[PDB]
Structures are given as structure tokens and as C-alpha cells.
Design a protein around this ligand. Structure first.
Ligand SMILES: CO[C@@H](C(=O)NCC(N)=O)[C@H](O)[C@@H](O)[C@H](O)/C=C/C(C)(C)C
Ligand SMILES: [Mn+2]
Ligand SMILES: [Mn+2]
Length: 284
């Protein structure tokens, strides 16, 4: 047996960031200045995005190595926070629209945007950790779902097939292809197993802003006319549900849970379209 439905816990105090680490503009504001930026980046921005992506990937991998029964989601956030700050990076989630932590931790039926707290991971859980770094005036965003202890076959397979969907989508990225191929590939692959691909949450362009106004759908919708071009940078971050797509948001305003409490899995990378194909910016 796996655990039953989650409830929110208590947050630790806000984690500080040394003042020499520049903040994104939206920290200490209610909204963010984003959504109207160009989608193709300049070579100088891309170079800085490789640095931000590698730091985010290191923070994700170090917090993922900690995932085990008995560990809290707050302890994962401490590891991610300290990794970013030791690397001179600001955690992009911290203070975005008042989000109180440095990464998102989404167990089990939480589709996304779970808030690190006193929740104890236990055997059988699947734990998504989502970390974004802001350094050099740019962002790098990545996430992965990690098993804790011996995960039930249905849940294990959900995670492994969501990772495979994500990688198949990434491997479609090439200049001249329609962006809509990403969602066509993910949803065709997920529908082999009877899973439902989340529609209301999406990938996005990313650069000097976190969510730059480019939207990447993870379901099939061939009427989008956007083409991938060299220098475009965006995330692929599909959420895939065992159950229905209906969802609820907790009173914290962030945590999104499936209404049927069936589990859900996600993986994410920040990608660059190159002249011949794709480059994963959020790799070690
Ligand atoms: C699904 O989540 C993505 C997203 O909201 N996409 C756009 C959308 N409207 O669906 C998001 O970019 C995550 O990858 C990111 O790590 C988290 C950021 C905050 C919690 C600070 C917002
Ligand atoms: Mn993310
Ligand atoms: Mn993202």
C-alpha cells in the first residue's frame, strides 16, 4: 500500500540570500514583469543561460539525491537553496508572486507548485522537485520526479513513462519544426497507457524573464502556428496524470492537487534550439 491524501504543513522561516546576489525584479513586488519578451535569444543571453541551467541542474540533482523516506520537503528546499546561493544564484521561485520557498516540491497527487514544508516523505512516494536559478540576469528551470523507497508498479511506471515522454519531446526539437510537435508526441505516448496530459499548466519561453509569454502546450493542438527557430529557449515540462484532469488549489494559493487524488508525475528541462537540433541547458 501507498500513503493516503496529503495535507499542508508548516513552513520554515524565510531563507536569506546574501545581498551581493542580484535579485530578479519581481522579488518584493506582487506581480512579475514578464510575458512580452522576444522568444529568440541573443548569443550573450544563451551563454549566461548555460550557466544558470547547469547551476539549477546541480541543485536539482543534490536535492534529488536526498529524497528518501523520513526526509521533509523543507530539507529538500534547504539543500536546493544553499546550492544556489553558494553558486551566487538567486532561487527564482523565492518571492515570485509571494511564493515563499526556493523550489517546488510536489508529491503524489500534487500536480505542481507544492510548497516545501514539514511534510515527511515516506516509502512509496513520488517526489517532484522543481528548481529555477537566476544568475547573470537570466533563468534556468528544471524538475524531476524521484521515487522514495519501493514505489508501487502503477506509480513507478507513471514516472518512467513521463520521463520517456519528456525525452521524446526534447528529441523532436529542431529548427523549422512546429512547436506543436512537442504536445503531439507527449500526448500520443501518454495515451498508449491511458494517462491524461495536463492542459492548464504548460511549458514556457524563458530567458531574461521566467515566463516570457511563449507557451509550450503538452497536449496535441496542431492549430498553433509557432515554429522552433535557432536561438529560441523554452521549457518542456509535462505533467501526466493517472486519473482525471480535474484539480483543486489549496488555500495557500499555490498547491495544485488532482480532485480524485490519483498521482501525477512531471519532468522539465530548459532547451535551446540550435542550428541542427536541440541543446539541454539544464544538464550537469
Ligand atoms: C507548471 O509550472 C510552470 C508554469 O507555471 N508554467 C506556466 C503555466 N501557466 O502553466 C512553472 O514554469 C514551473 O516550471 C516553475 O518551476 C514554477 C514557478 C512558480 C511556482 C514560481 C510559478
Ligand atoms: Mn520548473
Ligand atoms: Mn517552468
Amino acid at each position: 500500500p501507498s500513503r493516503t491524501a496529503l495535507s499542508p504543513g508548516v513552513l520554515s522561516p524565510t531563507r536569506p540570500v546574501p545581498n551581493w546576489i542580484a535579485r530578479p525584479e519581481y522579488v518584493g513586488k506582487p506581480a512579475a514583469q514578464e510575458g512580452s519578451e522576444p522568444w529568440v535569444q541573443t548569443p550573450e543571453v544563451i551563454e549566461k543561460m548555460r550557466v544558470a541551467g547547469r547551476i539549477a541542474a546541480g541543485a536539482l540533482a543534490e536535492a534529488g539525491k536526498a529524497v528518501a523516506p523520513g526526509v521533509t520537503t523543507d530539507e529538500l528546499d534547504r539543500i536546493a537553496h544553499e546550492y544556489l546561493v553558494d553558486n551566487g544564484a538567486y532561487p527564482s521561485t523565492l518571492g515570485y508572486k509571494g511564493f515563499p520557498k526556493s523550489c517546488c516540491t510536489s508529491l503524489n497527487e500534487v500536480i505542481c507548485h507544492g510548497i516545501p514544508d514539514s511534510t515527511v516523505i515516506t516509502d512509496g512516494d513520488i517526489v517532484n522537485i522543481d528548481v529555477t536559478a537566476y544568475i547573470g540576469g537570466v533563468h534556468g528551470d528544471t524538475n524531476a520526479t524521484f521515487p522514495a523507497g519501493d514505489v508501487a508498479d502503477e506509480h513507478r511506471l507513471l514516472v518512467d513513462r513521463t520521463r520517456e515522454a519528456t525525452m521524446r519531446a526534447i528529441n523532436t526539437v529542431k529548427p523549422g519544426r512546429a512547436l506543436s510537435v512537442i504536445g503531439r508526441v507527449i500526448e500520443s505516448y501518454a495515451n498508449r497507457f491511458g494517462y491524461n496530459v495536463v492542459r492548464d499548466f504548460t511549458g514556457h519561453g524563458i530567458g531574461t524573464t521566467f515566463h516570457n509569454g511563449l507557451v509550450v502546450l503538452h497536449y496535441d493542438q496542431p492549430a498553433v502556428e509557432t515554429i522552433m527557430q535557432p536561438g529560441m529557449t523554452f521549457t518542456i515540462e509535462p505533467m501526466i496524470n493517472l486519473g482525471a484532469l480535474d484539480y483543486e488549489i489549496w488555500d495557500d494559493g499555490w498547491t495544485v492537487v488532482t480532485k480524485d487524488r490519483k498521482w501525477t508525475a512531471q519532468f522539465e528541462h530548459t532547451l535551446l534550439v540550435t542550428d541542427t537540433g536541440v541543446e539541454i541547458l539544464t544538464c550537469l
